[PDB]
Amino acid sequence: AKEIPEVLVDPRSRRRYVRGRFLGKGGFAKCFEISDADTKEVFAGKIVPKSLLLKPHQREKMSMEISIHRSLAHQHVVGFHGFFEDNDFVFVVLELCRRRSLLELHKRRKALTEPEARYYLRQIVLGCQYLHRNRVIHRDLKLGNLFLNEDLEVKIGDFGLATKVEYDGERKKVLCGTPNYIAPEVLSKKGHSFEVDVWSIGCIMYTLLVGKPPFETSCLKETYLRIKKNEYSIPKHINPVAASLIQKMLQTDPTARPTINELLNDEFFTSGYIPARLPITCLTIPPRFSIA
């Protein structure tokens, strides 16, 4: 079996952490609320057993993730607060996001109001703008990788498929993993860079407004044939300006898409109502956005 330790100690930083409430399993890691015994502050604790990292390549992938993720501090990126290990386990200490991800929100709400979509998309774009000037492609932007804190602020997490562009006009040929909103240039194996993230944000924009993902079928390889052919449609009730931004992002030619630093200056953002913040009720109930 090999049980997880009830207390978790960091030998370099001399910080102790009590294993609180269980949050959920993703792949290898069991995640937990964890408390500094002295500071009482709460974190998310990613906990992977080393019995699942028996392979050097699985260790290298985990090293790259930490190296990339720890190099990052931004308002709309999950804060990296440190990592450590004993003989049996690896430990990652992260910014806690108490209201889970946009996937859970979408499962409960489906199509959001337009101002809600603007609101979440502005923050995702901001977070992803910081990644891109820091030469990081995330490569798996999706609802489940987009976390919400107590104030409904977005935090991009999970740099497991992330890579760093080391030189100019470098085209990545390797992606060990399967992104959810995978770009057509990844699928056709042509080479890829930053535009991959904009593609995925366009899929996110569609899903948040329409209430279902743009290329979904019963078969994953059929989905991939739709992505290759650019085979999707926007329901007529979606406003023309929103529809138009989606179209710009969901182009096959990566050079034809807009840059991450172009996005926030689109008419969709500059000329629509963006709330400063959302009440907690928005997890469950469509906001009306009254003046009362």
User: Which positions touch ligand ANP (CB under 6 A)?
Assistant: 23-24, 26-27, 29, 31, 44, 78, 94-97, 144-145, 147, 157-158
- Whether 86 sits among the annotated catalytic residues: the reply is no
Which candidate, 174, 242, 152, places its Cα nearest to that of 204?
A: 242
Rounded to a whole number of angstroms, the minimum distance from the CB of residue 172 to ligand ANP is 19
Residue from 52, 176, 256, 280 that binds Zn ion (CB under 5 A)? 176
Give me the residue label for tokens 């290759």: 228
Residue 111 interacts, among Zn ion, Mg ion, ligand ANP, none and using kind-specific CB cut-offs from 5 to 8 Å, with none
With CB cut-offs between 5 and 8 Å by kind, which of ligand ANP, Zn ion, Mg ion, none does residue 78 bind?
A: ligand ANP
Please state, in angstroms and rounded to a whole number, the distance separating the CA atoms of residues 249 and 196: 10
Stretch that binds Zn ion, among 81-89, 130-138, 174-182, 260-268 (CB under 5 A): 174-182
Label residues 206-224 b or e (16+ Cβ within 10 Å = b): bbbbbeebbbeeeeeeebb
Catalytic, out of 10, 140, 168, 253: 140
- What are the structure tokens assigned to 278, written together? 């959302």
Alpha-carbon distances of 131 from 31, 64, 123, 281, rounded to whole Å: 24, 15, 13, 30
Cα 224 to Cα 189: distance, rounded to the nearest angstrom: 12
SS3 36: strand
Residue 56 interface partner, choices Zn ion, ligand ANP, Mg ion, none, CB cut-off 5-8 Å depending on type: none
Q: Which residues are annotated as a binding site for ATP?
A: 23-31, 46, 95, 142-145, 158
Tokens standing for 32?
A: 């937990």
Number of Cβ atoms within 10 Å of the Cβ of 197: 27
CB closer to Mg ion, 116 vs 158 = 158
- What residues between 142 and 171 interact with Mg ion by CB under 5 A? 158, 160
282 binds, among Zn ion, Mg ion, ligand ANP, none (CB under 5 to 8 A by kind): none
Contact between 26 and Mg ion (CB under 5 A)?
yes
As beta bridge partners, residue 91 has: 47, 84
Nearer Cβ to Zn ion, position 1 or 174?
174
Q: Catalytic positions, please?
A: 140
